[PDB]
Amino acid sequence: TRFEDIQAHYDVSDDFFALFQDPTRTYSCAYFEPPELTLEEAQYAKVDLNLDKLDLKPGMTLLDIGCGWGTTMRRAVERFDVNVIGLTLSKNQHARCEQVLASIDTNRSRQVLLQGWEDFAEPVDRIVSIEAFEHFGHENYDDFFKRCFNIMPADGRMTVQSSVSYHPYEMAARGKKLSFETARFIKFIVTEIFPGGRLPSTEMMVEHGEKAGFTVPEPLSLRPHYIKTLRIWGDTLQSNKDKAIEVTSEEVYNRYMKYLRGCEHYFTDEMLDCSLVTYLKPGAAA
């Protein structure tokens, strides 16, 4: 009701995001390995970083939870010769993914579903989830990891890439001034950028996975890559200010410059992180 309306206020057209993102319209941390990659190349490098952890063999089925514009699923079909299932809650992303997957020269099964993981109960081999706020941004971590564990075979693996904060206790350790300042900035992100969202901690991502029965090796920090990503997003949005304002408003432009510049700052000050966590079932190949 009211809340919904107050949140709907912060809905932004896909056309605005196109004015700061790379041509793939990837809205997640890029991977600058090597460091000289373009943003677009680094976004393909991040997809590869995720898929290369999943022990994908031809004829397997990969589930993409929050499949975005279909880039991850397409790369998986092309590189690994796998079937793919994507989950998205965006009608626009659903339509684009169906066309992206239909375009692929393959006999492998390609399916895109307009639903959450809560309503998904089909057997799959491997799972990838890259900064899926619509799926991994509303708690019920115990149900999420239990679902992922139960739909995979004995050798199942999953990657989840997510922005993270620290427990208030850990934040206090690194300055009380900076601790409050960060907590107020997180409140802005979860009010105006990802309304109703909840930023997990790495410790939560690890411990909820372990409780479900997964082996969880040391998470990969993407912090330095997200600083680079947010710098390019900010610099690109600023270079398109007139076009961005015309498509939305000066309010929305200022909101996203605050978000992009702000995240770069709190990432640089090591008050935010980005974790790529691998979840291994007990029977996962060594």
Ligand SMILES: COc1ccc(C)cc1N
């Ligand atoms: C992946 O980028 C897109 C998504 C949706 C539409 C209509 C166009 C493009 N280029």
Ligand SMILES: COc1ccc(C)cc1N
């Ligand atoms: C990584 O997925 C997310 C992105 C943004 C926010 C606020 C929360 C989550 N889980």
